[PDB]
Amino acid sequence: GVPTYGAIILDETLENVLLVQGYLAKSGWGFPKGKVNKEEAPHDCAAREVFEETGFDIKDYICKDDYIELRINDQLARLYIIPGIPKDTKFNPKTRREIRNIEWFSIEKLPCHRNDMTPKSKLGLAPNKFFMAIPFIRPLRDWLSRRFG
Ligand SMILES: O=C(NCc1ccc(F)cc1)c1cnn2c1CCCC2
């Protein structure tokens, strides 16, 4: 699959992260990210996708070595970590045709796994609106503990 790039944006307290909500198949909440274009550098794709989805330009803030990368079903997703962005920042996507809403979420309240259905003796996982963000949460919390305190 084609690699994806984006950002995990945190506020100044390091408490909260910015998630975006799409439509249809992308109807839940997830980090801003998207597919890399031909010959485009990872940092440029991340900034591009983040600016298209949030209206916020991370180019002056990206640190090259500060990201979380996950390979999920053979697609690689790398989110650059961008702390310190004020919570009163005005985010607006380029078009409401792709992005429904943009919100801050408390990191400590976000799930870092989906719940099974053991109550009902049924296999699998219950739906969770944070399903695209979930795989990054534990690695983010571990990364913040290491790199900050
Ligand atoms: O990325 C997602 N959500 C946030 C988002 C990011 C960019 C955007 F333009 C709109 C919403 C998402 C949700 N479900 N799927 C995805 C991606 C691929 C697998 C299905």
Curated annotation (Swiss-Prot):
Describe the processing and modification events after translation: Phosphorylated at ser-249 in a MTOR-dependent manner.
A Gene Ontology biological process noted in the UniProt record is:
histone mRNA catabolic process
Positions contributing to Mn(2+) binding: 49, 53
Quick check: keyword DNA repair in the entry? no
- Tissues of expression: Expressed in brain and testis. Not detected in heart (at protein level).
* Localization per Swiss-Prot or TrEMBL: Cytoplasm, P-body; Nucleus
The record's GO CC annotations read: cell junction; cytoplasm; cytoplasmic ribonucleoprotein granule; cytosol; nucleoplasm; P-body; RISC complex
> What GO annotations for molecular function exist for this entry?
5'-(N(7)-methylguanosine 5'-triphospho)-[mRNA] hydrolase activity; 5'-3' RNA exonuclease activity; manganese ion binding; RNA exonuclease activity, producing 5'-phosphomonoesters; telomerase RNA binding
Q: Which residues form the Nudix hydrolase domain?
A: 1-131
Tell me where it mainly resides: cytoplasm
The answer to whether the entry has keyword Ligase is no
Impact of changing residue 52 to Q on the protein?
A: Loss of decapping activity
User: What is the residue range of the motif Nudix box?
Assistant: 34-55
Q: Which family does it belong to?
A: Belongs to the Nudix hydrolase family. DCP2 subfamily.
Q: What does the annotation say about its assembly with partners?
A: Found in a mRNA decay complex with LSM1, LSM3, LSM4, EXOSC2, EXOSC4, EXOSC10, PARN, XRN1, CNOT6, UPF1, UPF2 and UPF3B. Forms a complex with DCP1A, EDC3, DDX6 and EDC4/HEDLS, within this complex directly interacts with EDC4/HEDLS. Interacts with DPC1B. Interacts (via N-terminus and C-terminus) with TRIM21 (via N-terminus and C-terminus). Associates with polysomes. Interacts with LIMD1, WTIP and AJUBA. Interacts with DDX17 in an RNA-dependent manner. Interacts with ZC3HAV1. Interacts with APOBEC3G in an RNA-dependent manner. Interacts with ZFP36L1 (via N-terminus). Interacts with NBDY.
Q: What does this protein do?
A: Decapping metalloenzyme that catalyzes the cleavage of the cap structure on mRNAs. Removes the 7-methyl guanine cap structure from mRNA molecules, yielding a 5'-phosphorylated mRNA fragment and 7m-GDP. Necessary for the degradation of mRNAs, both in normal mRNA turnover and in nonsense-mediated mRNA decay. Plays a role in replication-dependent histone mRNA degradation. Has higher activity towards mRNAs that lack a poly(A) tail. Has no activity towards a cap structure lacking an RNA moiety.
Q: What is this protein called?
A: m7GpppN-mRNA hydrolase
Species source reads: Homo sapiens
Protein encoded by which gene: DCP2
Region of the whole protein represented: 96 to 244 of 420
